[PDB]
């Protein structure tokens, strides 16, 4: 599908509200496997199970290992821009 | 298989 830019708004007491799988060491992108109901990713409306997370806040995640992506993603605060694609 | 993290 088309590459999309998606904005997510998160408070500091919350996580992103997604489960991710995959990563470079497995030869696949960082993939959203769950959107947890009522949490920030669900509320933002534009992120979905099956989306590959290509970048967050301009940080490329295409070639990132799983735990690298966890560190990068969990570091982001407030208004967070995602670049995603559903294949 | 691949790991999953909740974030």
Residue numbers in the entry:
A (entry chain A): 284 to 370
B (entry chain C): 4 to 10
What does the paper say about this structure?
In previous work, we have investigated the binding preferences of a PDZ domain that is known to interact with the C-terminus of the cystic fibrosis transmembrane conductance regulator (CFTR). The CFTR-associated ligand (CAL) controls the apical membrane half-life of CFTR and is a validated therapeutic target for the disease cystic fibrosis. We have previously described a peptide array-based approach that enabled us to design a selective inhibitor for the CAL PDZ (CALP) domain. The result was iCAL36, a decameric peptide with sequence ANSRWPTSII.
For proof-of-principle studies, we chose to further diversify the position with the highest baseline affinity, i.e., P−1 in , by introducing three halogenated substituents. Thus, our initial set of ligands enables us to test the feasibility of affinity modification by preparing and screening a larger library of chemically-modified peptides. At the P−1 position, we coupled trifluoroacetic acid, 4-fluorobenzoic acid, or 4-bromobenzoic acid to the side-chain terminal amino group, as illustrated in Figure 5A. All three peptides reveal modestly enhanced binding affinity. To explore the stereochemistry of these interactions, we also solved the complex structures of CALP bound to each of these three peptides. The modified lysine and the terminal moieties are oriented similarly in the complexes with and with the additional P−1 substituted peptides. Furthermore, the distal functional groups overlap with the surface on CALP contacted by the acetyl group of the P−3 lysine in. Thus, S−1 and S−3 can intersect and could potentially be bridged using a cyclic peptide, a strategy previously employed in targeting PSD-95. In addition, the substituents increase the contact surface area of the modified P−1 lysine residue by 69, 32, and 40 Å2, respectively. The P−1-substituted peptides are the four highest-affinity ligands, and rank-order switches are found largely within experimental uncertainties. A limited set of four organic acid modifications of the iCAL36 P−1 side chain revealed modest enhancements of affinity.
